[model samples]
Target: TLSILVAHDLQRVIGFENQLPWHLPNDLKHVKKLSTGHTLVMGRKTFESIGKPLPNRRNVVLTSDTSFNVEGVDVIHSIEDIYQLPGHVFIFGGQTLYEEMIDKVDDMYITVIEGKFRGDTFFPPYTFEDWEVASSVEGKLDEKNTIPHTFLHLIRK
Candidate 1:
């Protein structure tokens, strides 16, 4: 199944110049746990945000730049090329990828980090018109991070 996973603030702000604005270690662990056995479909900027290929999963990067390349990753030109690939495909994105793939995702695993943030990039505007919350879990604070966050698994209605 194709899914989207993201951590965004209340304003739907996701990043500032390819970097996350908040510090949430627990959320990071949750992301790793959820994506460990899945395939990640991300745009070039998102891949650069982490500066390396994620370990233990297939990384498929979508980029139109012909010269852009990364070792140990499947760098493809269009989202179309990813259509027939194997395994669960999760869009781990920058705003552009999320905006482009939002309608195609079957499910959304979202971490709604509770706060107001200043950012240059935002998650694309989406209506809950045909979506419903399937499951959600509240996260606890750790010594390293005190931000409150809620994990939501949303399914198409």
Candidate 2:
């Protein structure tokens, strides 16, 4: 199954200076829960921001740089290559990668973090015309995760 996993603020801001704009431990946990043991597809920048391949997941990097290689990461040059990846492939993105794969995803896992943020990158504008909310839940706020957010599972209609 092809899916997208993203977390964005009300303004659709997703990144600040190559990193997440806010600290939300629960959101991170949510990402881990869904993506572990699955293939994680991301742009080179997003992979670099993470610094290394996430443990126990198949890390695939989309980059034009054919020379770009990492010990445990698979490097593919184009969007078309994503179609060849097997199993539960999750597009764990940067803005460009999200925009490229949005139309092709079978479902989406979105964490809509409340409030606006100062960010340099934003999630692409997507109208959920072909999607239905399969589930929705409020993320618990605690000392480490102070921001309010909602997790949504949207399946293609």
Candidate 3:
């Protein structure tokens, strides 16, 4: 299945100056739990921001830069190349990749943070009109994770 995994604020703002605008540890954990065994498709800047290949999952970087090479990641030039990947694929994004792959995804796992924050990059606008909320869970509020957030698993109808 092709899927999207992302976290954004109520305004759909995802990042600020290339880094996440907020710190929510549970959101990170939620991402890891769902994508660990799946192939992760991401943009070059997303990969670079993370520094290195995420462990235990196949990392595929989509970039037009043909010469771009990383030790443990696969570099693909087009969205069509993702179709040839072996198993479940998750589109891990920056704004551009999310916009490009939105229509093609079969599922979307989203963490909706409660408040707005300063951000330069935003998640593309999607209504999810053709999908169903398969699951929804509210993340706990604590010392480290102070913000209220909800995890939603949406599957295409």
Candidate 4:
């Protein structure tokens, strides 16, 4: 199945200055669990920001620049040409890829941080009118993170 996983603050902000706005170790753990053993596709800037391939996962990068290439990473020029793989493929984003793949995914996993944030980059505007909440789990504020968040699993209608 094709899915997307992202974390956004209350304002729908996903990034700032090409980096994440918050330091949430738990969120990293959550991401590791979901993306491990799966195919992860992200924009070139996203891959560059990360600087390396995530261990135990296949990394696919989308870039219009044909010269863009990195060792151990697959580069693709188009998101629409992605084929069905044997295992799950997840769209990890830097905003552009998410917007392009929003309607192509069958499911979405999101972490909604319960606070406002300052960011220049945002998740593309989308509506849940055709999506149904499959599950939701509330998280508590801990020493590592001051803001509480809810993890939601939504399925497309």
Candidate 5:
């Protein structure tokens, strides 16, 4: 079975002007643990935000435009191409990609934050009826930052 992991918030929103500085450690750890020897698929914008392909996983950056380039990043034009990826694949997002993959995914490992913040990009509404709540984690951010957070693991029914 294929697996997809997403780092997101309660609003389904994503982005922080640049790379995500908050929750970087947990996310990286999650990527390393879950996506190692696997594949990580992300949008062109999200790829640039991280500034590098996630090590230990084959990185596929989705983009219609071919102008942008990053080493170790494979660019794909369509979801069908992603549908063909081997092994477990992680979905890092900027909203559109996540919404598109909602039905395609069998399960989702989501980082659900508690705070309500403003963002231009938002996560699509999750219909709990179609999924089972597998886990929820109340996470604490870095002491320097001290932000409150949570995580939710949902399996498609």
Candidate 6:
């Protein structure tokens, strides 16, 4: 089963400049702890963001052009290529990939930042209808984002 996990701005999910809006802690850790011994699939750009494989899990990069040589990571051309893995599924993405996989997602963990930011990229809207809030925790209150950010875990309804 595929699980969609994301955090984005309501205005847009991908920035014109191609950058992320918020800066949370290592998202790999969150995904790793949740999907330990799992497989992570991402786009070329998303794969490039990390520049390396995450230990203890298989990192597969999605790309039409499989010309890049990443030492520890494997490059996969499509989502179907991921079916061979027997572990949990995690799609850590830039934007396009996440949008394509949301319907099949089983769970999500979004960390809401304390304040808003100026950026071209944003996570898709929180679709609470198909999801049930499993956990929510307030991030350390800071002046930057006074609205009070939270970490939300959404599971399939």
Candidate 6 C-alpha lDDT tens digits along 1-157: 5665555544444343655656555443455686667777888887676667778877778899958778878888887776665667777776778777766677876755545568755556655788898998776645544344566888989
lDDT (CA) per prediction: 0.89, 0.94, 0.92, 0.86, 0.74, 0.67
Best by lDDT: 2
Total clashing pairs for each candidate: 0, 0, 0, 0, 1, 12
Which residue ranges in model 5 land beyond 4 Å of their true spot? 21-24, 140-145
Candidate 6 backbone overlaps, count: 12
Residues 42-99, candidate 1: write the lDDT tens digits: 9988898889998988998998889987887888898888788788889998899899
Query: Candidate 2's error at 79, in angstroms?
Result: 0.8
TM-score of each predicted structure versus truth:
0.95, 0.97, 0.96, 0.94, 0.85, 0.78
The digit string of per-residue lDDT tens for model 4 on 1-157 reads 8998899998889998889988887888889999999999899998998999999999998889989878889888886656645588888897888888888899999998888889988887767788899999887678987778889898999
Across residues 33-112, which tens digit of lDDT does each residue of candidate 2 receive?
A: 99999999999999999999998899999999979989999999989999999999999999999999888899999999
lDDT of 5 by residue, 38-121 (tens): 888888777877788777679999999868677888889988898787777778776778878877888888776556566667
Q: Rank all candidate structures by their lDDT, best first, as comma-separated numbers.
A: 2, 3, 1, 4, 5, 6
Query: How much is 123 displaced in model 4, in angstroms?
Result: 1.0
- Encode model 3's per-residue lDDT on 1-157: one tens digit a residue: 8999999999999888879989999998998899898899999998899899999999999999978999999999988999999899999998999999888899999999999898899888877678899999999999999999999999988
- lDDT for model 2: 0.94
Error of 6 at 81 (Å): 2.0
Question: Least lDDT summed over 10 consecutive residues: which range in candidate 1?
Answer: 122-131
Candidate 2 segments exceeding 4 Å error: none
TM-score of 5: 0.85
